[PDB]
Design a protein around this ligand. Sequence first.
Ligand SMILES: CC(C)c1ccccc1-c1ccc(S(N)(=O)=O)cc1
Ligand SMILES: [Zn+2]
Length: 258
Amino acid sequence: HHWGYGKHNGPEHWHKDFPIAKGERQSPVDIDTHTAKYDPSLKPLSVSYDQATSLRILNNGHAFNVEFDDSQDKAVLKGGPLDGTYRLIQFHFHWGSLDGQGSEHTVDKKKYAAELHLVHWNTKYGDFGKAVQQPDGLAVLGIFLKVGSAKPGLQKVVDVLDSIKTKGKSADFTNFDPRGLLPESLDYWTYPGSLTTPPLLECVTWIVLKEPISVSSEQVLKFRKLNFNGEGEPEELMVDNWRPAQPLKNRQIKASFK
Ligand SMILES: CC(C)c1ccccc1-c1ccc(S(N)(=O)=O)cc1
Ligand SMILES: [Zn+2]
């Protein structure tokens, strides 16, 4: 009886195995655009993905992860609210069963169709496992998806999904360029928070881009063909793998833009 997103093991149940679920800096949150304050001391974000080395794509039973070689400073996030250098380790998405839901963060209570998480760890902690034990261990770049025009840079991901339909399946996934997943503007909101899946550790500086990317209906439909179950199990479509907004508590969301 492990955690998931079903009727009986979903977000409202997680606190029983992971008490930090009701903690002081949990994610995601609703971004109230009128209450977020412009912080003129925030730097432009530095996204350096030109040397990114993707390796593999994995269905882990709750999302799919596109994994990167993070044994050197090849793809890094710096600047913005961050001190130091954060290495890209993986990206994944959260999405809905319908276009009206799927994102984890919300913007004035608006839910997007999906949300991309580019996960980075602080190199001062040496590796990912140590980093998640630190309050400034991770930087996650969050990007909203809306349904409209196709995102050409997403298509290579969409097309490999039939090869990783079920839990525990992986496929080689080299030479994927995550720059093709970025919107034009790097304007962002930022706040201190947590992993949005168990173990829900409070180790994340969240940087959520204001500008969503557009993906096509066909692209998101292919996400919804994935399975939470393993091969040879009853099919449970991988949809609605998002945690809802959590209480903001004693936190201020800062904006990089006026
Ligand atoms: C399960 C978690 C510790 C983990 C392990 C290995 C690689 C990635 C992650 C991880 C899981 C979720 C997130 S998230 N949803 O971006 O907050 C970010 C990172
Ligand atoms: Zn995520």
